[PDB]
Amino acid sequence: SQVQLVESGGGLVQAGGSLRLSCAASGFPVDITWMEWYRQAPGKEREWVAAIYSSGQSTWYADSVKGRFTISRDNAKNTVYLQMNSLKPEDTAVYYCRVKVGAWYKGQGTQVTVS
Amino acid sequence: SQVQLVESGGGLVQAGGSLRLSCAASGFPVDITWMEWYRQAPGKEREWVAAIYSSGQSTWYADSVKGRFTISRDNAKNTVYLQMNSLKPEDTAVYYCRVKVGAWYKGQGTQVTVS
Amino acid sequence: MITAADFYHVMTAMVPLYVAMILAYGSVKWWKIFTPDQCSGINRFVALFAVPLLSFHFIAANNPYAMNLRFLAADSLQKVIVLSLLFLWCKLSRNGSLDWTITLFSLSTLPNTLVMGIPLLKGMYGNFSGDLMVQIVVLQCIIWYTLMLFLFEYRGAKLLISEQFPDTAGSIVSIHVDSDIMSLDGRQPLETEAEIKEDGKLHVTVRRSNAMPPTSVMTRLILIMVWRKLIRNPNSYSSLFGITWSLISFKWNIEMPALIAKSISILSDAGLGMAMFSLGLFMALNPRIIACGNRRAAFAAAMRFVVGPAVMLVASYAVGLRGVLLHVAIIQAALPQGIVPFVFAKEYNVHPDILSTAVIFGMLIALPITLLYYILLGL
Amino acid sequence: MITAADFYHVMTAMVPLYVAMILAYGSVKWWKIFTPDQCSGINRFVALFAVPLLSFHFIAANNPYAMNLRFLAADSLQKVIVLSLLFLWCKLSRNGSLDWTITLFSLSTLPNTLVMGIPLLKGMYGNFSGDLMVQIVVLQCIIWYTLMLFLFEYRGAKLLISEQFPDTAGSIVSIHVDSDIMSLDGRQPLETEAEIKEDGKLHVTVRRSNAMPPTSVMTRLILIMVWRKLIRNPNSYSSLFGITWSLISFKWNIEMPALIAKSISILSDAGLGMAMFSLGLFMALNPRIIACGNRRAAFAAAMRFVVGPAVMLVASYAVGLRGVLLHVAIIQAALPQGIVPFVFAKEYNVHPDILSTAVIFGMLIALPITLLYYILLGL
Ligand SMILES: COc1ccc2cc([C@H](C)C(=O)O)ccc2c1
Ligand SMILES: COc1ccc2cc([C@H](C)C(=O)O)ccc2c1
């Protein structure tokens, strides 16, 4: 009945800034299981970045972005917040959430671009 | 040209005696390689007992007759002497030599029988 | 009454079938000649080379402009009366699923017509039975092995959506399948992914994993997962060129040239003997003959030799087959179970143990049961 | 001169042979369908079931009381002139062994007559060539695959005594072989043991290991090691019952009954197509076509298409074959190399690389060479 995923926080910024990404959800019974965050480069590839899930104290990261990006889930507002710091210039790619309610639901709404 | 293998030493004796078996050969070029001594029971089977060969300081023995029977080769007289001590009563079998000149040559001549 | 010569002409064309089967069953269990890894070598050959060149020889010789259209209706009336009653069962009862609908359909209205049915009925009612038994082989390889192929895809395309979209199954528009997938089964991990659009439209993409919808949507996902299962099946290339040559040849009276006709007749003559030799190897790879139990093995010969023929005895008074055509229509339904309905149940795992019993146990009683129908119709 | 129809009747019965071979060569190297472990499944089937039932059908139909005894002498004169000259080479020269005598004999006087020779010559000189080409198949499967079987045992029974009895080889009376051994080869360890008697008599027993003699002695050891290689070979049970039925049937005019004749004709028709399909798999299991080198692959086609036929051109003036029988005798010697002379050279390791070349390279030039002999004899 018109299920909705809302993304916010992105934009254009220079190198060395800070952004606060978001992924708001509404209209699900459970909506916890295993959520992700990943990039989508203009060179056709896609690297999985961060994940928070039902454990909460376990985050699966990559090697290049290891220990530098902050992930946080709000179970009350049904929103996962993504804080990113020391933004490298290779961030022209689109960065969005991959919520999972048993099957993977996704959106596309950001314009993350770092000069 | 009438090659000849001569065996001697056997006979009938009670338990606890001593016998001196022999295997004399004549008419070969080399006649060293790997010689044997084995039993032939009336229960159709045959257990390999002792062996002296080109090394000389290596004798392959069995488990039941281990370290109790004396083997000795005479390279001059072309005769291998077999001294046996503490003769067990299960020695009704025929005990003879198995000289090897590249193929296995054998005889049959003894009457080893222990009551 | 009958003669003793008619009993002899049956044994002339049924004894060379069992000789080619006992030598296959004997040379594995008794003398241990073939390794069971090497046993897959012959079963690979018969499925690809012998049978699709054997079915091409019967279809491209059968006249399409003189098919007995009255006999062809009273066999398309068995497969509709049985198909209408089973869908009345799976949608009104309290325990009727679709996993029992197809299995109770392959046991009843799909005999072994090509390999075994043609030489038996040729040795019972002259040579015009040898033309009628080809006219059913054409319809099985072009309709009734295709309608059954949709019923396994619809069995699969319902599970993958109902397992993983239980809450918002009603607002999906398009479904996109990557070309890696050949069978949405659960054999492969099948990471399912769903795009979200603005006004409730919801694109769904089915992928490969590393490390109810509208009926205008299910009738697109199925037709993609049938076109990928039809251009790989070699028998679909046999019956396509068989009908196309037969519509050309029997109008302008063109006879097929001897350079091509003898090029196919060197493998097609190696098709009927090897098929009974490949089937004889199959009845020794199993651990037991009766696998699922003695309470369901007799159920196989209850929905095949009774409910099979006796529904054509009432589907032949309606169309108007009497005399000699009535006896040939009843006997061709009491033939043992075909092998192509097993091949489907082995891939999709829809009861492989029942159809593995009905083929092997069906062959061992196929002779002394159809001979009872030859006697009781001759009086 | 000739017609264009005679060129057509050759291609009618030679094109279906190469179609059954290209599909075997293609489906391994190009499309990779068969696993090479499963490739041994079909080669196990053709050696045991297809061929010994195919050779039984030709021998038990051939009339023995009307064999062309003049044609049967001018093919037993090729295989004696060649066999007399090679033993003059291995006993007078300075480098003539016996390991080169047999290999220079199988390349010259043993063509492929059963599978490929019969359909070619039937399509060139009417139907009486189809009866003559069976009358050579009988003599190959009963004499010239048996005299060659003694020459591999005498190659083996000389090595085992001359290696391990170099000094007292002249005073051995009897040789006893245990029933474990099937081939005194060196494949098995073969502990040799010699009893000693009183007056120079020397019994020898050949065993299995765990963890010159008088000519009245060598002609007993060989006849034991041939009787053990003849009651296991399935083709020796084909030609034995083939001749026995044919001597009965063509005197009292008994025709073979249709229950038995159709029992064999379901496997024998699956024999000629499968043999060319099994041979096509063999020309892709090898790493290279030309294996031992380009200086000996052309030697194979030098002792097979030249020294083979041109010694029958002088062995036919002597017997007195002119006219039409002269052309059929020359062409049947230029056929490509048989497969049974390879089977021997693979077991006994007497040059397996040369005969593996001459079979495969012999098939690829068999057609454009015998067609040259059809033209040059027609002028
Ligand atoms: C591996 O053994 C097989 C495979 C496929 C077969 C197909 C057929 C035809 C198409 C049919 O009877 O309906 C017959 C026998 C067969 C044996
Ligand atoms: C595994 O392929 C074979 C094995 C044996 C064969 C025998 C023959 C006959 C006996 C012959 O030609 O002389 C033909 C072809 C054959 C192919």
Side-chain angles (χ1 to χ4, degrees), chain C residues 43 46-47 51 111-115 140-141 145 235 275 278-279 338-340 343:
Chain C
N43 293 114
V46 179
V51 173
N112 210 343
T113 307
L114 189 146
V115 170
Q140 285 184 356
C141 293
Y145 286 166
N235 294 320
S278 177
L279 191 146
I339 304 100
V340 182
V343 175

Side-chain angles (χ1 to χ4, degrees), chain D residues 146-209:
Chain D
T146 298
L147 180 60
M148 189 173 69
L149 194 145
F150 285 103
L151 290 175
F152 288 104
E153 297 294 325
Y154 182 75
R155 191 258 186 187
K158 185 173 72 69
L159 291 175
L160 190 143
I161 294 173
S162 67
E163 284 183 352
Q164 296 177 358
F165 296 96
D167 295 328
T168 319
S171 67
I172 298 170
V173 176
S174 71
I175 297 173
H176 302 284
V177 176
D178 288 331
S179 66
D180 195 4
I181 304 166
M182 293 183 288
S183 178
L184 49 96
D185 198 4
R187 182 181 295 114
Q188 295 175 356
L190 296 173
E191 179 181 1
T192 60
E193 185 178 4
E195 296 289 332
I196 297 170
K197 298 296 181 183
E198 292 86 3
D199 55 355
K201 293 183 180 181
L202 191 70
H203 295 282
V204 172
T205 301
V206 178
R207 293 185 184 274
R208 185 70 60 83
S209 178

Side-chain angles (χ1 to χ4, degrees), chain D residues 334-377:
Chain D
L335 291 172
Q337 181 65 42
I339 304 100
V340 182
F342 168 56
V343 175
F344 287 102
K346 186 176 173 67
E347 291 181 353
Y348 295 99
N349 294 115
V350 182
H351 291 89
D353 290 331
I354 295 171
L355 288 173
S356 66
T357 299
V359 173
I360 296 169
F361 183 75
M363 290 294 291
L364 297 177
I365 61 170
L367 190 65
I369 293 300
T370 61
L371 288 174
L372 182 63
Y373 290 106
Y374 179 73
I375 297 169
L376 293 174
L377 289 175

Side-chain angles (χ1 to χ4, degrees), chain C residues 42-266:
Chain C
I42 300 170
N43 293 114
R44 186 71 178 172
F45 175 74
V46 179
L48 291 174
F49 292 101
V51 173
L53 289 175
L54 182 60
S55 67
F56 179 74
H57 182 72
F58 286 159
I59 295 170
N62 193 3
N63 194 3
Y65 292 98
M67 294 176 71
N68 193 358
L69 293 172
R70 185 173 291 169
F71 182 75
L72 199 67
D75 193 78
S76 295
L77 194 65
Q78 181 187 8
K79 299 175 180 65
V80 171
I81 294 172
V82 176
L83 190 63
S84 294
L85 292 177
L86 295 178
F87 282 166
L88 189 64
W89 181 63
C90 70
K91 299 292 183 182
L92 274 76
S93 67
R94 67 181 66 251
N95 52 0
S97 68
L98 193 144
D99 292 331
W100 287 99
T101 301
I102 306 167
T103 305
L104 290 174
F105 178 74
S106 296
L107 286 172
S108 66
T109 62
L110 286 175
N112 210 343
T113 307
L114 189 146
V115 170
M116 188 176 174
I118 296 170
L120 177 61
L121 271 300
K122 188 185 288 184
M124 292 174 73
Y125 292 100
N127 288 318
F128 66 96
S129 67
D131 186 75
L132 293 177
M133 291 297 107
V134 180
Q135 291 176 354
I136 298 171
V137 168
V138 178
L139 266 74
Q140 285 184 356
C141 293
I142 210 67
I143 291 171
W144 298 103
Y145 286 166
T146 298
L147 180 60
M148 189 173 69
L149 194 145
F150 285 103
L151 290 175
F152 288 104
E153 297 294 325
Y154 182 75
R155 191 258 186 187
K158 185 173 72 69
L159 291 175
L160 190 143
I161 294 173
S162 67
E163 284 183 352
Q164 296 177 358
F165 296 96
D167 295 328
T168 319
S171 67
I172 298 170
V173 176
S174 71
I175 297 173
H176 302 284
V177 176
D178 288 331
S179 66
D180 195 4
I181 304 166
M182 293 183 288
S183 178
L184 49 96
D185 198 4
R187 182 181 295 114
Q188 295 175 356
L190 296 173
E191 179 181 1
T192 60
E193 185 178 4
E195 296 289 332
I196 297 170
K197 298 296 181 183
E198 292 86 3
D199 55 355
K201 293 183 180 181
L202 191 70
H203 295 282
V204 172
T205 301
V206 178
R207 293 185 184 274
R208 185 70 60 83
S209 178
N210 288 318
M212 61 182 179
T215 60
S216 178
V217 182
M218 293 298 292
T219 56
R220 183 177 175 179
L221 177 60
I222 290 172
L223 273 73
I224 300 299
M225 289 302 295
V226 170
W227 180 256
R228 292 181 182 178
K229 297 295 289 183
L230 193 64
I231 66 171
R232 275 77 175 269
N233 198 1
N235 294 320
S236 65
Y237 292 105
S238 179
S239 295
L240 183 62
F241 293 103
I243 301 169
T244 304
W245 180 255
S246 66
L247 291 174
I248 293 172
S249 177
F250 287 94
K251 184 174 174 66
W252 292 273
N253 290 316
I254 296 171
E255 187 179 1
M256 180 169 66
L259 293 175
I260 293 99
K262 296 292 180 69
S263 297
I264 301 169
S265 179
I266 192 166

Side-chain angles (χ1 to χ4, degrees), chain D residues 70-81 139 143-144 312 315 319 332:
Chain D
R70 185 173 291 169
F71 182 75
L72 199 67
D75 193 78
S76 295
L77 194 65
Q78 181 187 8
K79 299 175 180 65
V80 171
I81 294 172
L139 266 74
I143 291 171
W144 298 103
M312 286 188 70
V319 184
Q332 71 95 26

